Each structure stands twice: as structure tokens, then as C-alpha cells.
Amino acid sequence: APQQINDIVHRTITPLIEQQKIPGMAVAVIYQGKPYYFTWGYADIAKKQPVTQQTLFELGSVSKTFTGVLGGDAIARGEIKLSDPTTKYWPELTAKQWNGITLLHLATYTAGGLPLQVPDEVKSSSDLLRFYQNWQPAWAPGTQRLYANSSIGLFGALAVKPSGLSFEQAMQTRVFQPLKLNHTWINVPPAEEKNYAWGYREGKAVHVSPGALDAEAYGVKSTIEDMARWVQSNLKPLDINEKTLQQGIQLAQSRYWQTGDMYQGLGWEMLDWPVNPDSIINGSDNKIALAARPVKAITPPTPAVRASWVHKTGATGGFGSYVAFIPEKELGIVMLANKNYPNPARVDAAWQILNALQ
Ligand SMILES: O=C(O)c1ccc(CCNS(=O)(=O)c2ccsc2C(=O)O)cc1
User: Catalytic center at which residues?
Assistant: First the structure.
């Protein structure tokens, strides 16, 4: 813990927790590739259990970074191609709006307006097929971006089909185990519940509810230590010894589409470094309920750029998470909290910390 990191982290996060009334928080800073950990407050207010480096937080849409990397690993295995039609992996999807919609479009939210959430009514595999068959795109494929769990969720499910494995087993064996993320879970096992923080929403304790495509879109829980290790793996994929996983991480940071100053990867989003802080700060707003934005295709996709701000926000009803890193500077941050507080306050704190260290 060098005093400078200690000082910028406490100087930034202390007022963040006060203003946002966050019950519990863990932060990791990766600096010159080494992790430094900080924690505050309570994993479980009622039971007086503190946040520790072993506390599990719900990552919410940060889970989409794992789905994009797992998809990247399947491409690198030669199991799928992003240029494949969706129907190649789900031939029961016969409705003609699907002609021309590829795995790329599903992975990058550019299928033509798939909705943010899969309806609660949708449970069984037959419900899911009915839902997609009935879905009417607002736009031609590859023209507009509309962030959507029903889009990347479906990408994650289709992407593991040729493997033979369930999504969870594919994720454990191909991503969590090789990276030694041994306290990262799609389903929290009973032995681990003692570490699982409660989320707080309007001051009620809550955990994420089951739903269709939950594992694929928002269902991972992890510790600050594992998430530091996730950032390290994404900062420096060349250190990873599993050839397809290395390549997969690299593919998830390729630049597929541009809107404004942002580039869409698989799960990750990226901006050129140095970034305008107001551009990433205002650019995070899950207070715009639906922003549909025109995309320009990057033909062909640019390979992972080292001078990028690579990041992802994520929330559940009770949790707020943020991950950001700059490959060229070997520098990153993870912030995990058990309240869903506004995204601009996350990116502002993250930028203030990494700016000061850069
Ligand atoms: O009980 C469920 O199945 C459930 C749980 C959490 C959520 C919110 C999870 N966050 S998210 O992936 O759906 C999302 C959506 C818009 S922003 C965002 C995020 O995670 O930042 C949705 C449904």
C-alpha cells in the first residue's frame, strides 16, 4: 500500500460513500500490474458482518465481460464465428426477421432493437423461443445499438452450444478455473453464503432474482480479489497460458462498432486514452432507460488497442459495480458496492483515482 494510492483512494471513496450512503464497498486498484485492496462498511447490516476481501458482490452487467470473453474463447476454439447467422445455432428460430441477424449483432446489441430485459413471463426453453420468434425489430440489423440483456444473453447461450457444455460449466472450466477465479460464481454454493453480501435497495436487503438468461447477462457474483485478478487478466492477456482464452480476451476488446466516442467490444466498451473524463462520466447513464444510438461499423474490427480506457458498469437491484483499466499503463480499478448508486458517480471516482496514478 504506497501512500499515494492510499491517499487518492481514501480521499475519493470516503466522500463517495457519504454522499451516496453506500452500506459496504470494496475497491481494488491495479498499479504497475500489482493489486491493492480497500474495504469499508457492511456486507450485512443486520448481522453486523463487515466487507472483507472475501465478500461476494453481485456484479450485475459486469457479468457481460465474462460472457464476451467466453464467446471470444469459443471463436478462438473454432466453435462459432461472429459472422455466423443466429439460426445456425438455433434452427428453430424460423421467423424471417432473423435472416441477416448474426452472432456479432447479438454480442454487440446491434440486432435491431432487442429489448433491454427478457420479460418476467419467459421461463422455459419453449417460452424463450416464442419470445424471439415474436420479437419485431425496429431497425435493420447492424444499424443501431440498444443495450440489451436479451441480445448478449442470447449470444452467451448460443455461443456455448457447440461445446456441449451448459453455460455455467463452460464458464467454470474455460474462464474461471484457468484464471484461478475460485470465489466467482454464477450460483453461490451453500458453503459460500457466509461471504455473500446483501444488496440494499431503499434500505431493504435483497439479492438478484432468477430470470431467463440471467447467468449470461447479469448473474455473476465475485470477490474483490477475483475481480482484481479478472482486471489483471484483461490488462495483459499475453500472460495467460491457455491459447484460446488469451485470444478470446483479445477478441472481447476488439472494436466492432463506434457510437460517439465509444467503441463496442464483446461485453467490454472502450474509448481512446487519454479520454475526456466528461465523455466517459456523462457517457455512463442508466438513467436514460433506453438510448438507441446509430452505430458505424468498424470494417474490419480494430484489434485491442493498448491506449484505451476499457470499462464496464453493472448493477442489480441491490448492487452497483464498475471496472475500468488502461492496458498501456498497466493500471486498473474495480469498485464493488452493495447499493445501486448512479453510474456517473462511479466513473467520476474511478477517473479521479486512475488520473491521479497515471
Ligand atoms: O431478477 C432478475 O432476473 C433481474 C435482476 C437484476 C436485473 C438488473 C441487472 N442489471 S442489468 O444487467 O439488467 C442492467 C440493465 C440496464 S443497466 C444494467 C446494469 O447491470 O448496469 C434485472 C433482472
Answer: 61 (acyl-ester intermediate)
> Vertex 141, ends 88 and 316: CA angle to 5°?
85
At 149, is the secondary structure helix, strand, or coil? Answer: helix
CA distance 274 to 280: 11
Q: Is 241 annotated as a binding residue?
A: no
Strand segments (E) across the chain: 24-31, 34-44, 49-50, 57-58, 144-145, 199-201, 204-206, 221-222, 255-259, 262-264, 269-272, 293-294, 296-302, 308-315, 320-326, 331-337
What angle in degrees, to the nearest 10, is found between the helix axes of 224-235 and 63-76?
40
**Burial class for 298, CB neighbours closer than 10 Å (0-12, 13-18, 19+):** middle
Does the beta carbon of 216 sit less than 6 angstroms from any atom of ligand 1?
no
117 annotated ligand-binding residue: yes
Domains and CATH numbers, the chain: 1-358 (3.40.710.10)
> Which residue from 57, 66, 146, 149 has its CB within 8 A of the most atoms of ligand 1, so it is best to mutate?
149
Residue 256 CA to residue 110 CA, distance in Å, equals 10
Secondary structure (3-state) at 201: strand
Ligand 1 proximity of 109 Cβ (cutoff 6 Å): no
Q: Is 151 in the pocket of ligand 1 (CB under 6 A)?
A: no
Q: Which atom of ligand 1 is nearest to the CA of 218?
A: 12
Closest Cα to atom 16 of ligand 1: 286
Find the helix or strand (DSSP H, E) in which 4 lies. helix 3-20
CB 136 within 8 A of CB 160: no
Q: CB under 8 Å to 114, separation ≥6 — which residues?
A: 106, 135, 137, 146, 148, 150, 151, 154
For residue 287 the three cell numbers come to 438513467
What amino acid positions are annotated as catalytic residues?
61
Q: Is 150 in the pocket of ligand 1 (CB under 6 A)?
A: no
Q: Is 60 in the pocket of ligand 1 (CB under 6 A)?
A: yes
Residue 45 near residue 198, CB atoms below 8 Å: yes
Buried b (16+ CB within 10 A) or exposed e, 193-220: eebbbbbbeeeebbebeebbbbbbbbbb
